[PDB]
Design an enzyme around this catalytic site. Sequence first.
Site, mmCIF file in Angstrom:
data_model
loop_
_atom_site.group_PDB
_atom_site.id
_atom_site.type_symbol
_atom_site.label_atom_id
_atom_site.label_comp_id
_atom_site.label_asym_id
_atom_site.label_seq_id
_atom_site.Cartn_x
_atom_site.Cartn_y
_atom_site.Cartn_z
ATOM 1 N N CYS A 1 0.703 -1.097 0.130
ATOM 2 C CA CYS A 1 -0.176 0.201 0.105
ATOM 3 C C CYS A 1 0.940 1.199 -0.040
ATOM 4 O O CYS A 1 1.657 1.298 0.946
ATOM 5 C CB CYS A 1 -0.879 0.002 1.190
ATOM 6 S SG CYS A 1 -1.885 1.557 1.492
ATOM 7 N N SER B 1 -3.048 -4.999 -9.779
ATOM 8 C CA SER B 1 -2.837 -3.718 -9.225
ATOM 9 C C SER B 1 -2.223 -2.568 -10.139
ATOM 10 O O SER B 1 -1.686 -2.993 -11.460
ATOM 11 C CB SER B 1 -1.644 -3.878 -8.127
ATOM 12 O OG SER B 1 -2.083 -4.833 -7.144
ATOM 13 N N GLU C 1 -4.496 -7.955 -0.415
ATOM 14 C CA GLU C 1 -3.978 -7.853 -1.705
ATOM 15 C C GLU C 1 -4.641 -8.584 -2.822
ATOM 16 O O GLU C 1 -5.145 -9.681 -2.345
ATOM 17 C CB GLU C 1 -2.427 -8.252 -1.428
ATOM 18 C CG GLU C 1 -1.252 -8.125 -2.804
ATOM 19 C CD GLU C 1 -1.472 -8.865 -3.963
ATOM 20 O OE1 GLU C 1 -1.871 -10.089 -3.676
ATOM 21 O OE2 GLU C 1 -1.303 -8.420 -5.056
ATOM 22 N N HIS C 2 -4.432 -8.248 -3.961
ATOM 23 C CA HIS C 2 -5.198 -8.435 -5.245
ATOM 24 C C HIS C 2 -4.534 -8.384 -6.557
ATOM 25 O O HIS C 2 -3.384 -7.570 -6.482
ATOM 26 C CB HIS C 2 -6.493 -8.009 -5.060
ATOM 27 C CG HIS C 2 -6.391 -6.528 -5.352
ATOM 28 N ND1 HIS C 2 -6.147 -6.099 -6.676
ATOM 29 C CD2 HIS C 2 -6.704 -5.444 -4.541
ATOM 30 C CE1 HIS C 2 -6.064 -4.617 -6.490
ATOM 31 N NE2 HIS C 2 -6.193 -4.293 -5.267
ATOM 32 N N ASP C 3 -4.977 -9.150 -7.604
ATOM 33 C CA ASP C 3 -4.353 -9.317 -9.027
ATOM 34 C C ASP C 3 -4.778 -7.634 -9.511
ATOM 35 O O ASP C 3 -5.509 -6.930 -9.138
ATOM 36 C CB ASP C 3 -4.864 -10.512 -9.499
ATOM 37 C CG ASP C 3 -4.426 -11.717 -9.008
ATOM 38 O OD1 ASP C 3 -3.208 -11.732 -8.267
ATOM 39 O OD2 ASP C 3 -4.927 -12.729 -9.113
HETATM 40 C C1 HEM Z 1 -5.883 0.866 7.245
HETATM 41 C C2 HEM Z 1 -5.966 1.385 6.153
HETATM 42 C C3 HEM Z 1 -5.374 0.458 4.690
HETATM 43 C C4 HEM Z 1 -4.922 -0.768 4.672
HETATM 44 C C5 HEM Z 1 -5.002 -1.843 5.617
HETATM 45 C C6 HEM Z 1 -4.679 -0.605 3.335
HETATM 46 C C7 HEM Z 1 -4.215 -1.968 2.544
HETATM 47 C C8 HEM Z 1 -3.831 -2.147 1.330
HETATM 48 C C9 HEM Z 1 -3.537 -3.256 0.741
HETATM 49 C C10 HEM Z 1 -3.436 -4.613 1.029
HETATM 50 C C11 HEM Z 1 -3.413 -3.002 -0.882
HETATM 51 C C12 HEM Z 1 -2.892 -3.875 -1.917
HETATM 52 C C13 HEM Z 1 -3.892 -4.054 -2.813
HETATM 53 C C14 HEM Z 1 -3.280 -4.442 -4.128
HETATM 54 O O1 HEM Z 1 -3.086 -3.467 -4.894
HETATM 55 O O2 HEM Z 1 -2.948 -5.705 -4.600
HETATM 56 C C15 HEM Z 1 -3.501 -1.367 -0.816
HETATM 57 C C16 HEM Z 1 -3.307 -1.004 -2.121
HETATM 58 C C17 HEM Z 1 -3.736 0.427 -2.174
HETATM 59 N N1 HEM Z 1 -3.967 1.512 -1.199
HETATM 60 FE FE1 HEM Z 1 -4.122 0.985 0.726
HETATM 61 N N2 HEM Z 1 -4.760 0.493 2.836
HETATM 62 C C18 HEM Z 1 -5.295 1.301 3.553
HETATM 63 C C19 HEM Z 1 -5.838 2.545 3.264
HETATM 64 C C20 HEM Z 1 -5.574 3.252 2.240
HETATM 65 C C21 HEM Z 1 -5.916 4.677 2.018
HETATM 66 C C22 HEM Z 1 -6.693 5.763 2.969
HETATM 67 C C23 HEM Z 1 -5.320 5.184 0.649
HETATM 68 C C24 HEM Z 1 -5.496 6.423 0.138
HETATM 69 C C25 HEM Z 1 -6.385 7.303 0.427
HETATM 70 C C26 HEM Z 1 -4.504 3.906 0.073
HETATM 71 C C27 HEM Z 1 -4.425 3.860 -0.970
HETATM 72 C C28 HEM Z 1 -4.064 2.674 -1.769
HETATM 73 C C29 HEM Z 1 -3.844 2.382 -3.393
HETATM 74 C C30 HEM Z 1 -4.180 3.580 -4.411
HETATM 75 C C31 HEM Z 1 -3.657 0.821 -3.549
HETATM 76 C C32 HEM Z 1 -3.479 0.435 -4.812
HETATM 77 C C33 HEM Z 1 -2.010 0.378 -5.320
HETATM 78 C C34 HEM Z 1 -1.917 -0.202 -6.735
HETATM 79 O O3 HEM Z 1 -2.829 -0.944 -7.160
HETATM 80 O O4 HEM Z 1 -0.660 -0.570 -7.159
HETATM 81 N N3 HEM Z 1 -4.968 2.892 0.926
HETATM 82 N N4 HEM Z 1 -3.920 -0.955 0.268
HETATM 83 MN MN LIG Z 2 -1.801 -6.679 -6.027
#
Ligand code: HEM
Ligand SMILES: [Mn+2]
Length: 299
Positions: free
Chosen positions: A30, A109, A105-107
């Site tokens: 993330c 990304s 986490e997922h495919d």
């Molecule tokens: C407790 C809070 C959070 C947790 C536990 C969390 C967890 C995760 C996880 C596990 C992923 C991986 C998904 C994947 O792409 O395979 C991810 C991706 C991502 N997260 Fe966080 N997230 C949280 C909050 C946030 C917040 C508040 C934002 C922005 C405002 C954010 C932005 C993103 C973005 C944009 C991705 C996609 C990355 C990509 O596809 O390359 N996340 N998050």
């Molecule tokens: Mn992923």
Amino acid sequence: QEPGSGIGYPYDNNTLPYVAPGPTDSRAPCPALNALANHGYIPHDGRAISRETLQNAFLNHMGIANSVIELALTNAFVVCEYVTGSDCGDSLVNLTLLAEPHAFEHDHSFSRKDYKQGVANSNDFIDNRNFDAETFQTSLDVVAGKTHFDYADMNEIRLQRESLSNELDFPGWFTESKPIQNVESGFIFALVSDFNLPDNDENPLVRIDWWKYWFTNESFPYHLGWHPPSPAREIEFVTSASSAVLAASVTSTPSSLPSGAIGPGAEAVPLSFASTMTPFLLATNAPYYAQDPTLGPND
Ligand code: HEM
Ligand SMILES: [Mn+2]
Ligand SMILES: *[C@@H]1O[C@H](CO)[C@@H](O[C@@H]2O[C@H](CO)[C@@H](O[C@@H]3O[C@H](CO)[C@@H](O)[C@H](O)[C@@H]3O)[C@H](O)[C@H]2NC(C)=O)[C@H](O)[C@H]1NC(C)=O
Ligand SMILES: *[C@H]1O[C@H](CO)[C@@H](O)[C@H](O)[C@@H]1O[C@H]1O[C@H](CO)[C@@H](O)[C@H](O)[C@@H]1O
Ligand SMILES: *[C@@H]1O[C@H](CO)[C@@H](O)[C@H](O)[C@H]1NC(C)=O
Ligand SMILES: *[C@@H]1O[C@H](CO)[C@@H](O)[C@H](O)[C@H]1NC(C)=O
Ligand SMILES: *[C@H]1O[C@H](CO)[C@@H](O)[C@H](O)[C@@H]1O
Ligand SMILES: *[C@H]1O[C@H](CO)[C@@H](O)[C@H](O)[C@@H]1O
Ligand SMILES: *[C@H]1O[C@H](CO)[C@@H](O)[C@H](O)[C@@H]1O
Ligand SMILES: *[C@H]1O[C@H](CO)[C@@H](O)[C@H](O)[C@@H]1O
Ligand SMILES: *[C@H]1O[C@H](CO)[C@@H](O)[C@H](O)[C@@H]1O
Ligand SMILES: *[C@H]1O[C@H](CO)[C@@H](O)[C@H](O)[C@@H]1O
Ligand SMILES: *[C@H]1O[C@H](CO)[C@@H](O)[C@H](O)[C@@H]1O
Ligand SMILES: *[C@H]1O[C@H](CO)[C@@H](O)[C@H](O)[C@@H]1O
Ligand SMILES: *[C@H]1O[C@H](CO)[C@@H](O)[C@H](O)[C@@H]1O
Ligand SMILES: *[C@H]1O[C@H](CO)[C@@H](O)[C@H](O)[C@@H]1O
Ligand SMILES: *[C@H]1O[C@H](CO)[C@@H](O)[C@H](O)[C@@H]1O
């Protein structure tokens, strides 16, 4: 940034400097968590993290209200129990376990490779956790030569990523994840849409340079005029944006999309794992940090 720099003022009046993660620090898949940890708003080592620590860090340093992360917190702790085999209470063991595949986490990304992307053999796996410049460039190139993009453009980006992943992943691995990904699409609009445009709250446009800085550097684009949204963004904005991305009309269709890719998406819901399911092994790579160039304390 350094607290005396005033770079966050008057939106964040208590900043801390960027510090790159070291080899033994834990980082996430993330970009938001990683930026928070790099600044010490959550532990710089990426370990032993409470819900309130996460809530306060997002609210006070990123302009993201508690409602936005409610489900994410639930799911982080579900995944922690699944990976570790015991209830983690209110101390998330580390950030790295969040890269457990086919879970949170997922495919497909935007900026990470898939766990079995391009692997010659079935039992093999790769780093699905650290920022990958080539993968992210496939997202950026959908909006090449542009400074901003809209919901329809975001829909095209996620379709491109689904196509590539379905083509490149080891046969049978690829699993579509529209609900979680498009919450993250909404997160991108929430954080780095251009609040200097008069219609931002209703018609948000992502500023590409802000997006690219955030993802590549895992720090905040203050030098480009960004600041935390004020007032803090709430969950309604995020899910409305998610809806709007998937509702946007597709004018360019990649080949190799999974069934039902074009169309509305299910609501994201709490995850659950059968107690007899053993977790997939986590990638062990050291945490990524920006090196071209490296970042200073105020970057
Ligand atoms: C407790 C809070 C959070 C947790 C536990 C969390 C967890 C995760 C996880 C596990 C992923 C991986 C998904 C994947 O792409 O395979 C991810 C991706 C991502 N997260 Fe966080 N997230 C949280 C909050 C946030 C917040 C508040 C934002 C922005 C405002 C954010 C932005 C993103 C973005 C944009 C991705 C996609 C990355 C990509 O596809 O390359 N996340 N998050
Ligand atoms: Mn992923
Ligand atoms: C973040 O936390 C996770 C979860 O605790 C860590 O992953 C786990 O790391 C342990 C080693 O500390 C691995 O245990 C080993 O497993 C092998 C194979 O089963 C076993 O033969 C060894 O004796 C040992 O018990 C465990 O496999 C691994 N979990 C998974 C699902 O991959 C992770 O290392 C932590 N990361 C950071 C940077 O702190
Ligand atoms: C992670 O570390 C494991 C051993 O601790 C290796 O068996 C894995 O292959 C994986 O290796 C990758 O990351 C480590 C960082 O610990 C590097 O040392 C390796 O070169 C590799 O990139
Ligand atoms: C930052 O400090 C200024 C000056 O006291 C104040 O006006 C402003 O509301 C503060 N910002 C926040 C987010 O508290
Ligand atoms: C990363 O940060 C550095 C230092 O502020 C900046 O020079 C560089 O342009 C940033 N990278 C991107 C891709 O925005
Ligand atoms: C986004 O979607 C959620 C439902 O998942 C709504 O509660 C919210 O108001 C917004 O439309
Ligand atoms: C839900 O909210 C988003 C963000 O305000 C809008 O863009 C969308 O049209 C819907 O009203
Ligand atoms: C976003 O909007 C869509 C349709 O407008 C809903 O189905 C979804 O639940 C969210 O409110
Ligand atoms: C939605 O609308 C677009 C134009 O914006 C069409 O190209 C597409 O076929 C669908 O009707
Ligand atoms: C059709 O229109 C969409 C949205 O305007 C674009 O993202 C796509 O590239 C094509 O030009
Ligand atoms: C590309 O093609 C698909 C159907 O294969 C359409 O649904 C889409 O709107 C675009 O024309
Ligand atoms: C329109 O956009 C789609 C999605 O990015 C591409 O796959 C297609 O080749 C065309 O450029
Ligand atoms: C983002 O949020 C919307 C509204 O809940 C979903 O329809 C979409 O699949 C994604 O989760
Ligand atoms: C959540 O749901 C799964 C099934 O998807 C159960 O196995 C688990 O125990 C929990 O009830
Ligand atoms: C977890 O570990 C078991 C063996 O203990 C595997 O069978 C399963 O596929 C998963 O890798
Ligand atoms: C990151 O580290 C490099 C040295 O490798 C410096 O040149 C740069 O200013 C930043 O401190």
